[PDB]
Amino acid sequence: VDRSNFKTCDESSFCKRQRSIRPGLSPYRALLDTLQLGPDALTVHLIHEVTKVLLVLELQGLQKDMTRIRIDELEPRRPRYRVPDVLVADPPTARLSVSGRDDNSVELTVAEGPYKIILTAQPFRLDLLEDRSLLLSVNARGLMAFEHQRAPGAWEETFKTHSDSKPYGPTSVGLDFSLPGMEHVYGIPEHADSLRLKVTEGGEPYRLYNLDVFQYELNNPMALYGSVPVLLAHSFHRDLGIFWLNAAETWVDISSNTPQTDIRWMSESGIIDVFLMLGPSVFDVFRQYASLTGTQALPPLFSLGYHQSRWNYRDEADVLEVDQGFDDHNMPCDVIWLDIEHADGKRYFTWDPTRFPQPLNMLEHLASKRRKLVAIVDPHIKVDSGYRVHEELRNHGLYVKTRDGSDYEGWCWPGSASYPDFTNPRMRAWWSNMFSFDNYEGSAPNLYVWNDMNEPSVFNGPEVTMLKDAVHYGGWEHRDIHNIYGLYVHMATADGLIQRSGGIERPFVLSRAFFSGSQRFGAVWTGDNTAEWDHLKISIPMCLSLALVGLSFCGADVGGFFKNPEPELLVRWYQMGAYQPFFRAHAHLDTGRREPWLLASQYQDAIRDALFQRYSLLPFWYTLFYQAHKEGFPVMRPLWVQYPEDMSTFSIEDQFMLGDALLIHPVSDAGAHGVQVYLPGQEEVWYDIQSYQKHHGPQTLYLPVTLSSIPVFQRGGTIVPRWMRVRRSSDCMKDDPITLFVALSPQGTAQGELFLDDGHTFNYQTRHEFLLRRFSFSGSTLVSSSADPKGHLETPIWIERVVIMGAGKPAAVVLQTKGSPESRLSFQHDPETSVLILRKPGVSVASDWSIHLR
Amino acid sequence: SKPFTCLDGTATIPFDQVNDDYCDCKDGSDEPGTAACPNGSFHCTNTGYKPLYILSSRVNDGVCDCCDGTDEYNSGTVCENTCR
Numbered sequence: 001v002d003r004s005n006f007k008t009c010d011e012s013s014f015c016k017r018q019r020s021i022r023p024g025l026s027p028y029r030a031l032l033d034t035l036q037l038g039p040d041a042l043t044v045h046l047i048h049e050v051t052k053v054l055l056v057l058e059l060q061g062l063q064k065d066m067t068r069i070r071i072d073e074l075e076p077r078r079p080r081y082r083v084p085d086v087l088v089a090d091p092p093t094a095r096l097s098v099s100g101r102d103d104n105s106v107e108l109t110v111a112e113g114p115y116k117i118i119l120t121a122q123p124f125r126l127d128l129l130e131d132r133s134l135l136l137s138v139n140a141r142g143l144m145a146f147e148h149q150r151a152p153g154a155w156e157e158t159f160k161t162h163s164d165s166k167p168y169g170p171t172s173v174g175l176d177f178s179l180p181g182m183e184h185v186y187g188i189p190e191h192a193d194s195l196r197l198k199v200t201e202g203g204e205p206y207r208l209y210n211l212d213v214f215q216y217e218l219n220n221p222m223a224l225y226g227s228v229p230v231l232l233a234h235s236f237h238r239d240l241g242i243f244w245l246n247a248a249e250t251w252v253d254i255s256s257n258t259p260q261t262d263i264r265w266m267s268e269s270g271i272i273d274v275f276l277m278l279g280p281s282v283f284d285v286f287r288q289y290a291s292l293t294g295t296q297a298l299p300p301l302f303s304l305g306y307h308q309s310r311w312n313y314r315d316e317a318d319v320l321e322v323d324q325g326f327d328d329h330n331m332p333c334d335v336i337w338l339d340i341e342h343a344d345g346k347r348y349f350t351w352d353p354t355r356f357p358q359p360l361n362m363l364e365h366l367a368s369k370r371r372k373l374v375a376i377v378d379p380h381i382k383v384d385s386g387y388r389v390h391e392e393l394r395n396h397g398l399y400v401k402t403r404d405g406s407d408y409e410g411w412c413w414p415g416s417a418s419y420p421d422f423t424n425p426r427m428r429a430w431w432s433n434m435f436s437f438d439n440y441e442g443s444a445p446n447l448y449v450w451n452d453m454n455e456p457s458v459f460n461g462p463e464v465t466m467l468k469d470a471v472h473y474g475g476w477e478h479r480d481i482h483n484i485y486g487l488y489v490h491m492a493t494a495d496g497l498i499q500r501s502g503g504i505e506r507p508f509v510l511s512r513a514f515f516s517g518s519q520r521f522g523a524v525w526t527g528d529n530t531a532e533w534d535h536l537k538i539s540i541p542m543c544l545s546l547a548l549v550g551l552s553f554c555g556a557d558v559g560g561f562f563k564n565p566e567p568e569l570l571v572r573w574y575q576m577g578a579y580q581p582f583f584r585a586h587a588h589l590d591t592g593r594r595e596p597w598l599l600a601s602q603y604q605d606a607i608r609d610a611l612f613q614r615y616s617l618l619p620f621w622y623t624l625f626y627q628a629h630k631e632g633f634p635v636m637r638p639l640w641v642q643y644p645e646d647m648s649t650f651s652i653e654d655q656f657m658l659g660d661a662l663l664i665h666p667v668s669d670a671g672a673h674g675v676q677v678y679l680p681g682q683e684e685v686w687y688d689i690q691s692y693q694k695h696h697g698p699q700t701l702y703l704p705v706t707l708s709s710i711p712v713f714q715r716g717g718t719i720v721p722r723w724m725r726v727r728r729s730s731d732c733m734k735d736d737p738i739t740l741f742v743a744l745s746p747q748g749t750a751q752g753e754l755f756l757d758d759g760h761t762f763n764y765q766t767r768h769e770f771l772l773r774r775f776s777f778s779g780s781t782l783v784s785s786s787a788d789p790k791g792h793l794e795t796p797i798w799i800e801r802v803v804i805m806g807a808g809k810p811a812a813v814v815l816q817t818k819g820s821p822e823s824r825l826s827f828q829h830d831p832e833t834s835v836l837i838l839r840k841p842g843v844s845v846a847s848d849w850s851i852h853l854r
Numbered sequence: 855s856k857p858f859t860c861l862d863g864t865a866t867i868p869f870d871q872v873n874d875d876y877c878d879c880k881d882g883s884d885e886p887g888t889a890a891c892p893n894g895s896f897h898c899t900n901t902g903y904k905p906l907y908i909l910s911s912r913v914n915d916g917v918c919d920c921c922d923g924t925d926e927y928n929s930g931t932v933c934e935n936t937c938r
């Protein structure tokens with residue numbers, strides 16, 4: 001990376017001004033005479049003691065144990081930005097009442113307790129309490145700063161060669177928060193940095209500004225492609241979350257101080273709009289945040305398989321050779337991807353007339369293999385009077401404009417290009433309609449989409465993005481809206497894939513830029529990583545930090561995007577990618593071809609094995625994603641989520657969990673002979689899923705590895721569903737029988753869930769056509785029951801096998817199904833491993849049943 | 855009526871466990887006509903062209919692997935004969 005391209009905080013004039021305010025007595029004070037308790041909120045005026053600028057504080061207690069703080073000018077010259085379309089609903093309020101008072105203090109109770117907020121009048125301060133316990137303070141370091149709109153580089157400003165006319169002058173807002181008892185914080189992606197956020201006292205703040213950073217480097221706080229302004233604080237005692245709802249450039253400072261962590265948000269414009277999510281558990285925070293910004297969109301099953309991509313596959317023949325290569329080499333794959341060279345000179349929604357002349361025939365060939373295709377569609381439109389897309393957008397005034405009123409023109413892949421104003425809903429509706437099979441000629445139902453460069457990337461723009469003073473719908477400046485431009489692209493694209501189907505088919509869209517609420521629209525990935533061992537390692541903390549803030553459908557380019565990975569590195573990257581949510585190999589134009597059958601057989605065989613492990617766990621992967629969709633719980637999890645009181649898990653990032661059942665520590669070092677696996681939990685057991693060996697937590701286990709090793713352990717008390725019949729793609733497998741893996745707890749119990757539907761439509765919600773099964777083991781009986789009776793499905797899926805780890809040899813096994821006579825099942829038992837295998841139960845997965853070991 | 859063994863010698867099973875859609879032989883020999891065994895094979899007779907073997911996982915996967923279409927007999931995919 002070339003850092004001189006991107007401003008440090010000192011080079012950002014609003015960052016420089018804000019950060020110069022150091023902790024001290026705040027000049028803001030609350031005018032308690034102006035206090036008013038309304039139907040939804042409490043409003044009180046604030047005043048700067050020196051400037052006599054008047055602000056309004058809108059304080060709200062919310063249902064589900066959250067508080068919202070909003071600060072705006074009392075009489076502003078012109079309106080300030082308030083972030084639209086990110087909140088899924090108007091958050092339901094809870095009544096506030098005054099329960100205490102004095103000449104410098106008002107105490108407020110949320111509903112009937114136990115949550116209380118103390119408003120101090122001078123200096124202005126907010127304290128949030130559960131009963132008499134202090135949870136969090138606001139403005140305790142006195143860092144509140146609110147630059148009011150002065151009457152029309154604080155004003156006009158230059159960086160490198162780019163000029164910001166800055167017509168509205170300094171307008172930044174900032175606020176500080178104190179977290180007593182918290183020593184670990186997480187979140188605010190995207191940064192190529194460790195999971196546990198670092199103190200910023202002696203260096204740069206964390207920066208949140210969606211930017212295209214070429215060959216980005218590791219362990220630094222530079223802004224990357226996406227920004228999610230959510231921070232999570234965890235201690236042995238509680239969990240809290242801060243959600244700073246601002247779409248402008250934001251810098252975040254973190255300092256530690258009995259233990260305490262302080263957080264300061266600094267934003268270029270808009271209002272102050274922050275949500276305090278009070279837990280107390282981390283899953284309460286997940287729920288609190290999900291109720292505000294939504295949940296992970298349920299991926300169609302195929303998108304959870306393996307994606308084979310590169311820049312670029314050459315032509316239709318190349319695509320079909322890649323397809324055939326998977327089958328000839330007995331390797332599963334669901335999607336082959338088409339990067340920018342598939343279109344006519346980077347004019348999106350087109351096909352190169354020589355290299356992709358018959359796209360429907362290509363897609364039809366892929367459909368007969370029951371595989372899908374993804375084509376890239378970027379949001380920049382080549383300025384070309386022969387390009388129909390450009391002519392329509394220009395003729396309908398749907399482009400981002402400059403202050404003089406002409407359409408903005410920058411530079412990207414097709415050369416000179418204009419940028420549709422995706423903040424304008426008329427533009428989004430246009431974009432969505434463009435994906436109809438009549439408009440996107442050559443597309444078909446098994447073609448899905450990739451949105452890239454949607455920061456937006458502008459090669460001749462400041463910091464490789466759009467000018468701060470470009471103008472969008474409603475007169476708002478680009479500096480106001482920057483961090484949700486990509487989300488609008490992702491949303492409009494995803495809605496287009498729904499619309500072209502008549503509202504029936506679920507979308508799949510991968511997006512590089514993102515914001516709060518992006519989880520509603522599909523997947524994201526960590527952009528242009530590099531073929532190096534430390535980039536492999538960093539995929540875990542990066543996707544973990546996206547998991548914590550709602551983006552469960554995360555991944556990194558398998559193999560690395562830049563450079564050529566060595567065969568050992570590619571194998572380890574596959575084993576790693578096979579256990580991460582979005583699973584795609586991708587590569588730069590000038591890299592060597594690395595389709596997995598081009599390696600020597602030893603590397604091929606390990607890669608095949610990793611692919612097989614992935615396809616077999618699809619029922620499990622699909623259920624975790626249904627739980628993420630319904631509850632807001634992340635699929636990939638840090639160990640401290642499952643073991644919140646084990647302080648040695650708070651920083652771990654070479655290990656992760658999938659739901660609560662699988663602990664994963666992939667090998668990420670060349671030539672490693674072993675790994676050190678921390679297995680947590682008092683009176684917890686773990687099963688090596690390769691050797692079936694039982695291990696007792698808590699411990700650090702030295703596990704020897706070979707090239708084929710993927711260190712995976714199943715937690716005792718869990719039931720994992722697998723498809724043991726690996727076929728060439730997920731469409732081929734989705735009517736096949738399930739095998740159940742029961743890892744017995746030390747108390748002889750276990751449980752797990754299974755979700756099923758058709759794999760790709762919305763029928764699960766519009767017609768309740770699905771199954772949610774709960775499997776429970778206790779005493780000596782495995783029972784299948786419904787976890788949601790609303791769900792019904794016509795399916796041939798049956799239970800073909802049950803594998804139980806940690807069991808003794810029974811004398812007999814008896815199956816009981818409603819509608820059937822009592823049946824006897826045969827079984828095998830290994831006395832060495834305490835593994836019991838129940839042969840062919842034969843029962844439908846829609847049926848209730850029980851198996852008894854005698 | 856006698857029972858069936860296995861081409862590798864790994865056990866013997868009753869004749870009702872041949873092609874019963876569960877894998878009982880380590881070599882997959884008891885399920886030549888189903889997708890149950892990971893290492894089995896399905897034989898395409900393919901009159902009018904070359905007879906072919908395919909993986910057991912490609913039986914009733916919805917994809918036409920034999921020119922005679924016999925690998926898809928209960929999958930919702932109807933394969934026309936194309937051995938010409």
Ligand SMILES: [N-]=[N+]=Nc1ccc(NCCCCCCN[C@H]2C[C@](O)(CO)[C@@H](O)[C@H](O)[C@H]2O)c([N+](=O)[O-])c1
Pocket residue numbers: 214310311339340376411412413414415452459527528586587588
């Ligand atoms: N105008 N034109 N002139 C040019 C020509 C070449 C240039 N350097 C290319 C930079 C390499 C890395 C690019 C990001 N890769 C994107 C897109 C893509 O590479 C393909 O869409 C995906 O594969 C990948 O996934 C994404 O992240 C430049 N230039 O200033 O960078 C200007």
Ligand SMILES: [Ca+2]
Pocket residue numbers: 871872873874875876877878884885
């Ligand atoms: Ca059998």
Ligand SMILES: [Ca+2]
Pocket residue numbers: 912913914915916917918919920925926
């Ligand atoms: Ca077939």
